[PDB]
Design a protein around this ligand. Structure first.
Ligand code: HEM
Ligand SMILES: c1ccc(-n2ccnc2)cc1
Length: 405
């Protein structure tokens, strides 16, 4: 389903990319998108899928569009339009200076200080999950670890019941990797049905949990409304359930195939942080966009007011102009250039939490289970959307080579 080309689009700039089902998916999700960076593709293209929209394909353009909120507005940040339209998450659907205030609160909730405080549970939960897996010689890394690890730390932070996971996660999934089973608005509404009662409850009777702080927070001298708090909370939910979850499976899949990468991190632990950035560069996984607030001419292309452009965060780091041999994972790169956590005013507040959860896992897994591989005859499938994922990650290992701690 290709939509007819608007009049301002030169046919030479057409490249029908389906962000929800790219062509080379079998090769891997990052490889499927990287086709956008082949020599035949212009820097800025137009696709007729998902209703027609632009795509910036180069780190330089993505950054520029990310900085330029005057032109590129966060009002309608998701493709397809109906999706960007119905979404009203804060602070993601606002531009500066309105953004700034809401931003400041969200940070109170997820920032450094919170992570600093949760470190021991993070470390505690990782060791517990791993030790529990170790003797089995086999998991489903996606369901066995990638999901629970991050999610249970979030639920703890938010003060929400673990029982809610399956329900929440389904709703969250529908948002980034739409199934077809429910539209964005229906999905959005359902998560909202959930939150409303919770928030009400926490404005009356506050806790120390994330929701309670958001619900009772101050924005621009006055109290935040319920509707605003709902809209921030909606964001936190997706961040907690849908991000680190998918990241970990791509990294673990890479690790399960590269013995030598595992070794390096084993003998030279000082490299873990470095490694973590490189993997954040290589297995980057977010793709959103902005809407044109007016007619504007960008890098010799005319953009009409109301046009959506996808500015895949994913691609900056995979761009050869930014990183030599981009599909090559080298833990010793002098400069790891990525925009995995975004760029500009909307830079990811949860990046600290995410880095802590990644480093804990690599350090802790490698300690106990140094030697693992993907199960024989396992066919790993990726998934594309706003946030890309791995469908399942069947791992096997010999228990005899593990180490209990
Ligand atoms: C590996 C994991 C993660 C990645 C790759 C990621 C990526 C991003 C990206 C690219 C943006 C900006 C989107 C835009 O500019 O439209 C963003 C914003 C945001 N992320 Fe993350 N994120 C991750 C994890 C988290 C976590 C764990 C949380 C907290 C629960 C979170 C909370 C936020 C919030 C609150 C913002 C909005 C900041 C603002 O609009 O000023 N993220 N994230
Ligand atoms: C699309 C969907 C989810 C997100 N997100 C939330 C937290 N971190 C990233 C950003 C854009």
């Amino acid at each position: 389903n290709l939509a007819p080309l608007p009049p301002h689009v030169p046919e030479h700039l057409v490249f029908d990319f389906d962000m929800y089902n790219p062509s080379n998916l079998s090769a891997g999700v990052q490889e499927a998108w990287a086709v956008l960076q082949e020599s035949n593709v212009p820097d800025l293209v137009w696709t007729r899928c998902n209703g027609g929209h632009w795509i910036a394909t180069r780190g330089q353009l993505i950054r520029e569009a990310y900085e330029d909120y005057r032109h590129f507005s966060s009002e309608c940040p998701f493709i397809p339009r109906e999706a960007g339209e119905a979404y009203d998450f804060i602070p993601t659907s606002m531009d500066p200076p309105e953004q700034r205030q809401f931003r400041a609160l969200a940070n109170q909730v997820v920032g450094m200080p919170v992570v600093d405080k949760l470190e021991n549970r993070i470390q505690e939960l990782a060791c517990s999950l791993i030790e529990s897996l170790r003797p089995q010689g086999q998991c489903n890394f996606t369901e066995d670890y990638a999901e629970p690890f991050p999610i249970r730390i979030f639920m703890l932070l938010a003060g929400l019941p673990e029982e809610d996971i399956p329900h929440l996660k389904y709703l969250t999934d529908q948002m980034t990797r739409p199934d077809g089973s429910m539209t964005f608005a229906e999905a959005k509404e359902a998560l909202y049905d959930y939150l409303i009662p919770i928030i009400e409850q926490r404005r009356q009777k506050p806790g120390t949990d994330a929701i309670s702080i958001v619900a009772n927070g101050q924005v621009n001298g006055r109290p935040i409304t319920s509707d605003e708090a709902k809209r921030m909370c909606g964001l936190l939910l997706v961040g907690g359930l849908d991000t680190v979850v998918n990241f970990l499976s791509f990294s673990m899949e890479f690790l399960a195939k590269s013995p030598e990468h595992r070794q390096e991190l084993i003998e030279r632990p000082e490299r873990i942080p470095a490694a973590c950035e490189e993997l954040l560069r290589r297995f980057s996984l977010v793709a959103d966009g902005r809407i044109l607030t007016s007619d504007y001419e960008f890098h010799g292309v005319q953009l009409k007011k109301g046009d959506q452009i996808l500015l895949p965060q994913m691609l900056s780091g995979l761009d050869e102009r930014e990183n030599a041999c981009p599909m090559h994972v080298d833990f010793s790169r002098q400069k790891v250039s990525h925009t995995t956590f975004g760029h500009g005013s909307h830079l990811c507040l949860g990046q600290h939490l995410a880095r802590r959860e990644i480093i804990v896992t690599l350090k802790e897994w490698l300690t106990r289970i140094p030697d693992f591989s993907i199960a024989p005859g396992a066919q790993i499938q990726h998934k594309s959307g706003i946030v890309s994922g791995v469908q399942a990650l069947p791992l096997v290992w010999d228990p005899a080579t593990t180490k209990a701690v």
